[PDB]
């Protein structure tokens, strides 16, 4: 599984969402280089315009592309679970607002890693930061604290994303993640570490569709 | 000046620092693509190990590589000031700890844009987050609010960098920037906007020296 | 490109320079053996005496004779650019003194490999270590940090040559290199590696002309 | 003594050492040409692999091959001590780590010059640059500061070898040398000069044994 990610791996991300009844679809494509811990993805909203701010969907849009140092390659659940993959489920709870509930299948379809996602957002305020598109088109550093879930033979991850709002304030997004293999068998369960993840959101200036270009760096840490 | 930045421009960054008497030097090199607003820089500490956390230096280490949208290219001081350049001076005031005072010459030496810097740090606590290297190796999104300083024929920029600390706190870095041209030629002086800048710090895993690989995206905004 | 270099290849080096107004010329000749990663070169200053210390000119005087280990022969730009060659251009910037700026074309011309160079040094102190010939007739070990220059279809290399002074101080020569191929075909463009270079300056005791015999040993490394 | 060295003299070097308990042996062989001040030596570790970085042992493995300019030949102890030879004894003291202590007898044995050495290093950090093999396979330029030792009818030499560490730092090896002749014979004892030494470490690519090819150029200087 691990040696599937030594080179640059093509990604394909595919979301079918619904936030407050607003159905939308994005098609992402990029490449990952787990060796450097970098993701390069471009997301198009193929249904028109994104009913939510693109920032709120970074984490929904393949942590198996994280750079795990040579020692804690023992704690790398994500790649271990490949090429069959894993199922990533989240409940992204935006403070003073609703929530997204995702369920994704991150797996190798051929030589390309695909993150096929289904998201359902509910309870969102039209006047709030997500539907009112009050979030800046930027992204900050977060630590994805991962812990084993012995019970489901997968992992669980908890973290709060800080979304910068245009007035100066921050919209907190509470992720409660869980990943479990699609796999017939063996996955490396981890001891408590984190993914130090950093992201930079941009725009292809020659691109008319509503899109996001995501540049992300992910490094496993917290184990000496 | 502006057309110097339409392609990918080689960068060279050169710092000579002194934080609390600790003299250090870094040599950065990369490339910038102002068209996309992206910087790719790798900094080596050529004097050994960095007495400060690499994060504290990101800002010191070429905003003439920002992507200014087609309706505010009139506000782009940075590129207008080229190839002679500008002098960027900062007082980076880390809350409750000490401060860096930089003075840099960002200019074209040949086909490559060089940021030759001189930094001097004072009133840093050994026990504090900078000398105690308590900052995470990560970087968040910031907005560099730029305003004209008509009398020095330059600009001023104000912003607070949020440095994430390993215990869970944030070390605030107050930048008070000023840029003034090197050439006698006239420059473009802006109406109040900001650079939305985002960064992602990584490591070349094949690199033994103390270094930082900086991936940064900069986009001018706040003018409709 | 690569198989031109599997034997001992005749070199012929020609410099015309001008440092602070002082025109000079050297003719170098010898042989390079890439299998070993060794150069045997002798430079004669054909205009009499060399206005600058012969060590300041060692990097100016055929990195295509680097020994690339088998596992990293995909990373050898220098030989891939052959026979048509490349153009090595540098800025050797002597700390606290002047700078050389060189432009050279390294290419095969019949059976031999010719490094034709033009150098222009400006802003030197006449009392400095270079014009004042304060440099020991020796040489150190240095790593030539190569990075790819996808745009110029070539490479950039960065290094500080340590030039030991008579009084036991060191004169750093910052070298900012850039190679672009002469021919039009594709070339091998590399991942960050370095050329481990070692040189030893000697004199032909049977030679009356101002000269330098250079024994160099160059070895690519940095990729496991 | 002097006229033994006017041609190319076969060398044969033999070390038996013990660093931290690790016994090893090397057999060196080559040739020295005092006229040029050059050594052509190849060292094979005959006990397999060398427990220490081959650079750490270059000064241990025939300064009688230094080129003395005709005017300071009266200052060449090393060759005056021949054929019966001298005994070079050193303390190579690796800053912040262990020390070698060597004792060697350099003398002719028939037509070749033999440096028979015994080395004992103790107090090495196994995580250090020497046992941890953190030293680049290269070598710098150094001045061997010779002083007379009237009292032991020989010489003392003092110098700090700069050993470049893979992370770009330098490991100083303080060398404290003392040569005394072996034979009854009168020796030439010198005024303060130095041996300008230069070396370049290479590999025989057709050699499977742990080895080092050393090209050295030594030139006496410091007396006008």
Segment (H or E) for D199? strand D193-202
Using omega within 30 degrees of 0 as the cis cutoff, is the peptide bond preceding A83 cis? yes
Q: What is the CATH number of the domain that holds C173?
A: 2.40.155.10
**How many other CB atoms are found less than 10 A from the CB of residue A173?**
25
Among D66, D70, D72, which residue's Cα sits nearest to residue D179?
A: D66
**Cβ-contact C65, C39 below 8 angstroms:** yes
Secondary structure (3-state) at D217: strand
What subunits touch chain D, counting only 3 or more CB pairs under 8 A? Answer: B, C
Using omega within 30 degrees of 0 as the cis cutoff, is the peptide bond preceding D83 cis? yes
Segment (H or E) for A217? strand A211-221
Measured distance CA(C47)–CA(C209) in Å, rounded: 10
**How many other CB atoms are found less than 10 A from the CB of residue B96?**
10
Instruction: State which residue of chain B sits closest to D164, comparing Cα positions.
Output: B48
Instruction: Name every chain C residue with its beta carbon within 8 A of the beta carbon of D218.
Output: none
Q: Which DSSP symbol is given to B79?
A: H
Query: Touching check for C66 and chain D: CB below 8 Å?
Result: no
Instruction: State which residue of chain D sits closest to C40, comparing Cα positions.
Output: D215
What subunits touch chain A, counting only 3 or more CB pairs under 8 A? Answer: B
Q: Bridge partners of D220?
A: D195
Q: Residues near C155 by Cβ (< 8 Å), separated by ≥ 6?
A: C77, C146, C147, C148, C149, C177, C178, C179, C189, C190
- Nearest C-alpha of chain C: how many angstroms from B75? 28
- B and D touch with 3+ CB pairs <8 Å, answer yes
Instruction: Name every chain D residue with its beta carbon within 8 A of the beta carbon of C216.
Output: 200
Measured distance CA(C93)–CA(C104) in Å, rounded: 17
Segment (H or E) for B55? helix B54-57
- C167-194 as b/e, with b when 16 or more CB fall inside 10 Å? eeebbbbbbbbbbbbebeeebbbbebbb
Q: Within its chain, how far is the Cα of C88 from the centroid?
A: 9
Cβ-defined contact of A215 to B200 (cutoff 8 Å) = yes
Query: Touching check for B209 and chain D: CB below 8 Å?
Result: yes
Instruction: State which residue of chain D sits closest to C69, comparing Cα positions.
Output: D205
**How many other CB atoms are found less than 10 A from the CB of residue C153?**
19
Q: Within its chain, how far is the Cα of B135 from the centroid?
A: 18
Measured distance CA(A129)–CA(A66) in Å, rounded: 30
Q: Give the nearest partner residue to C139 out of D198, D203, D219, using CB atoms.
A: D198
- The pair of three-digit structure tokens given for residue B189, joined into one six-digit string: 């002086």
Secondary structure (3-state) at A79: helix
What subunits touch chain C, counting only 3 or more CB pairs under 8 A? Answer: B, D
Q: What is the longest distance spanned by two Cα atoms in chain C?
A: 49
Range of the domain at A1: 1-224
Query: Touching check for B148 and chain A: CB below 8 Å?
Result: no
**Cβ-contact B40, B62 below 8 angstroms:** no
Q: Which of C147, C196, C221 has the most B C-beta neighbours within 10 Å, making it the best mutation to test the interface with B?
A: C147
Q: Give the nearest partner residue to C160 out of B46, B204, B206, using CB atoms.
A: B46
Per-residue DSSP letters for C95-125?
A: TTS-EEEEEEEEEEETTEEEEEEEEEEES--
In this complex, how many residue pairs, one in chain A and one in chain B, have their CB atoms less than 8 Å apart?
69
What technique solved it? X-ray
Query: Touching check for C192 and chain B: CB below 8 Å?
Result: yes
Last residue before each break in chain D (C–N > 2.5 Å): 61
Cβ-defined contact of B29 to C223 (cutoff 8 Å) = no
Cβ-defined contact of B207 to C192 (cutoff 8 Å) = yes
**How many other CB atoms are found less than 10 A from the CB of residue B170?**
17
Instruction: State which residue of chain D sits closest to B208, comparing Cα positions.
Output: D167
Measured distance CA(C196)–CA(D138) in Å, rounded: 8
| Beta strand ranges found along B53-140 (DSSP E) | 86-94, 99-109, 112-122
Instruction: For residue C103, give Cα distances in angstroms to A19, A207, B18, C59, C116.
Output: 60, 40, 35, 12, 8
Dihedral of the alpha carbons of B68, B70, B76, B81, in degrees to the nearest 10:
110
Measured distance CA(D164)–CA(D55) in Å, rounded: 10
Instruction: Name every chain B residue with its beta carbon within 8 A of the beta carbon of A141.
Output: 136, 138-140, 164
Query: Touching check for B158 and chain A: CB below 8 Å?
Result: no
Measured distance CA(A90)–CA(A102) in Å, rounded: 5
Query: Touching check for B46 and chain D: CB below 8 Å?
Result: yes
Query: Touching check for C91 and chain D: CB below 8 Å?
Result: no
Measured distance CA(D32)–CA(D67) in Å, rounded: 10
Instruction: Name every chain C residue with its beta carbon within 8 A of the beta carbon of B27.
Output: 158, 160, 174
Resolution, expressed in angstroms to one decimal: 2.4
Length of chain D: 224
Q: Residues near C22 by Cβ (< 8 Å), separated by ≥ 6?
A: C51, C52
Query: Touching check for B67 and chain A: CB below 8 Å?
Result: yes
Query: Touching check for C95 and chain B: CB below 8 Å?
Result: no
Cβ-defined contact of A198 to B199 (cutoff 8 Å) = yes
Number of domains in chain D: 1
| Sign of the Cα pseudo-torsion (B161, B165, B171, B173, in order) | negative
Query: Touching check for C32 and chain D: CB below 8 Å?
Result: no
Cβ-defined contact of A215 to B215 (cutoff 8 Å) = yes
Q: Give the nearest partner residue to D200 out of C137, C164, C200, using CB atoms.
A: C200
């Amino acid at each position: 599984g691990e040696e599937l990610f030594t080179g640059v791996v093509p990604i394909l991300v595919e979301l079918d969402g619904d936030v407050n009844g607003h159905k939308f679809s994005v098609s992402g494509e990029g490449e990952g280089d787990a060796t450097y811990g970098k993701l390069t993805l471009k997301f198009i909203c193929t249904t028109g315009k994104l009913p939510v701010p693109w920032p709120t969907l970074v984490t929904t849009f393949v942590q198996c592309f994280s750079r795990y140092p040579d020692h804690m390659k023992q704690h790398d659940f994500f790649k271990s679970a490949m090429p069959e993959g894993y199922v990533q489920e989240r409940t992204i709870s935006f403070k003073d607002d609703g929530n997204y509930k995702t369920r994704a299948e991150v797996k190798f379809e051929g030589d390309t890693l695909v993150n096929r996602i289904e998201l359902k957002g509910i309870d969102f305020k039209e006047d709030g930061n997500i539907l009112g598109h009050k979030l800046e088109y930027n992204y900050n550093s977060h630590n994805v604290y991962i812990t084993a879930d012995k019970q489901k033979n997968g992992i669980k991850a908890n973290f709060k994303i800080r979304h910068n709002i245009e007035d100066g304030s921050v919209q907190l997004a509470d992720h409660y993640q869980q990943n479990t293999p699609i796999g017939d068998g063996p996955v490396l369960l981890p001891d408590n570490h984190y993914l130090s993840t950093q992201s930079a959101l941009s725009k292809d200036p020659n691109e008319k569709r509503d899109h996001m270009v995501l540049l992300e760096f992910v490094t496993a840490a917290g184990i000496t």
